[PDB]
Design a protein around this ligand. Structure first.
Ligand SMILES: *C(=O)[C@@H](NC(=O)/C(=N\O[C@@H](COc1ccc(C(=N)N[C@@H]2CCCNC2)cc1)C(=O)O)c1csc(N)n1)C(C)(C)NOS(=O)(=O)O
Length: 485
């Protein structure tokens, strides 16, 4: 006869290098056998029995009422996480029913730096959120196992240090950032702000406990424009040397206007100035299924398959009929909703020059055989085109790193509101790859609703990119690609 459901230790979570991210700490817990007292021990008062309740700081009247609450049970928790020096005194009191049992509570050395991804456990050491829940059966002993994540705590800590201070400085509602290795699909960083300290889950609002990298969905905005140009090159609408007439016009009665008045722009200049008129005239010159297909090939609308709780696949339009105004707006954001993790996998394919690799939060044994979803030559051309964004004249010139070549694309989305209409709050986007000569990392920096002054990604989310991606290349010892080194 067994009256105990779980009575064993649990595993340990580390990063890809072996640094502790989630360690079990052994703690003693006082329990009692209520059937032992009533059947043969006999419920008594006075003696040292009263001092036993006086040591637990529980009144002897109600402590005796909790054990006597059921004369048939064989287990009852008197206290939790008792220290050894005082628990050894309770065992030395020789109680005819009280026993000691070695349990374990969790400690996370990263703390709030990896909180949304690591997660936590309940008082009985059962995973609830994040990696703790997704790999509970693996970590739980009954068959104890360890686990090594794909996160690099060196890069993870520097992404949080800049993303957390960016949300605070701009007084933004939220802020997410995802870093993924280009040619392996391994998630290196995954930070959110504001966060919580999983070592103490007291008064932490559940609104700040959601993994916004996989939960929040937003219209990607201008960040999908590289795929608009990449599709326009394969469909033969234009060539790399084409010049588009970017004069504002009206599709289906609604005005299509750029950020500024540009009479004509280069194909490279469209991604530079983020011309909605340029991408709209390209989308209208193609079948509507072209952009719907290419977006899917890069992972949009598809599941990320990480196994994390609350992981959304985003809203993706499957319409069979498209209005000309809906085809044009679909080129620069309107129409679909994707998580920051899905947007990172898009640029994880852009960096791979058209290779779609699955996302994994565990250390992968190389090599990772992906699947070529787009011609390598076209992506190489557009990736070099995206470098103009981080050069004088582009939108993400504030994201430029001193001594490196990067290819990025800024964005600014209008938040759809509670009643379905667009609000005056914006989503600042900045996503790109680096090094531009040989891509190795893909980064996405998205912050929710800036209120400090500016709101577009090129002025709010872009300087976060250059500060983060700057530290990523220094830590990984990547050779500079700048003309002036
Ligand atoms: C790309 O996503 C695209 N934005 C949109 O199409 C969407 N909304 O656009 C809103 C306007 O956003 C902006 C307005 C003005 C500026 C700006 N002042 N630019 C600076 C001028 C000075 C020199 N540096 C540049 C920036 C953004 C709106 O319509 O109110 C949209 C798409 S999907 C969705 N839900 N909303 C642009 C505006 C091209 N991205 O611009 S950005 O600079 O790359 O961030």
């Amino acid at each position: 006869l067994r009256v105990q459901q779980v009575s064993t230790s649990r595993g340990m979570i580390t990063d890809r290098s072996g640094r502790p991210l989630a360690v079990s700490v052994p703690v003693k817990a006082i329990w009692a056998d209520p059937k032992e007292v009533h059947d043969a021990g006999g419920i008594s008062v006075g003696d040292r029995w009263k001092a036993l309740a006086n040591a637990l700081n529980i009144p002897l009247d109600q402590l005796s009422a909790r054990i006597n609450a059921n004369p048939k049970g064989r287990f009852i928790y008197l206290a939790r996480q008792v220290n050894p020096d005082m628990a050894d005194y309770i065992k030395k009191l020789k109680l005819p029913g009280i026993h000691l049992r070695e349990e374990s509570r969790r400690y996370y050395p990263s703390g709030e730096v990896t909180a949304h991804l690591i997660g936590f456990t309940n008082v009985d050491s059962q995973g609830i959120e994040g990696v703790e829940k997704s790999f509970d059966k693996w970590l739980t002993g009954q068959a104890a196992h360890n686990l090594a994540l794909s996160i690099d705590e060196r890069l993870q800590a520097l992404v949080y240090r800049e993303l957390n201070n960016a949300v605070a400085f701009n007084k933004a509602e939220s802020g997410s950032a995802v870093l993924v290795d280009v040619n392996t699909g391994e998630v290196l960083a995954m930070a959110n702000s504001p966060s919580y300290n999983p070592n103490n889950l007291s008064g932490t609002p559940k609104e700040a406990m959601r993994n916004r990298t996989i939960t929040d969905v937003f219209e990607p905005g201008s960040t999908v424009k590289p795929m608009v140009v990449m599709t326009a090159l394969q469909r033969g609408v234009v060539r790399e040397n084409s010049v588009l007439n970017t004069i504002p016009y009206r599709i289906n009665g609604h005005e299509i206007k750029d950020v500024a008045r540009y009479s004509e722009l280069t194909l490279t200049g469209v991604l530079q100035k983020s011309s909605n008129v340029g991408v709209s005239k390209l989308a209208l010159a193609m079948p509507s299924s072209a952009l719907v297909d290419t977006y899917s090939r890069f992972g949009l609308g598809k599941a990320t398959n990480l196994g994390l709780v609350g992981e959304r696949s985003g809203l993706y339009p499957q319409k069979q009929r498209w209005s000309d105004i809906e085809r044009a707006t679909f080129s620069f954001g309107y129409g679909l909703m994707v998580t920051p993790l899905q947007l990172a996998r898009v640029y994880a394919t852009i960096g791979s020059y058209g290779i779609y690799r699955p996302l994994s939060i565990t250390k992968v044994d190389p090599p990772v055989p992906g699947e070529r979803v787009f011609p390598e030559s076209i992506v190489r051309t557009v990736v070099h085109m995206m470098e103009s964004v981080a050069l004088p004249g582009g939108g993400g010139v504030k994201a430029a790193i001193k001594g490196y070549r990067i290819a990025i694309k800024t964005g600014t989305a209008k938040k759809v509101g509670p009643d379905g209409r667009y609000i005056n709050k914006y989503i600042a986007y900045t996503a790109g790859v680096a090094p531009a000569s040989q891509p190795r990392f893909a980064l996405v920096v998205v912050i929710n609703d800036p209120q400090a002054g500016k709101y577009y990604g090129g002025a709010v989310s872009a300087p976060v990119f250059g500060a983060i991606m700057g530290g990523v290349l220094r830590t990984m010892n990547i050779e500079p690609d700048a003309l002036t080194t």
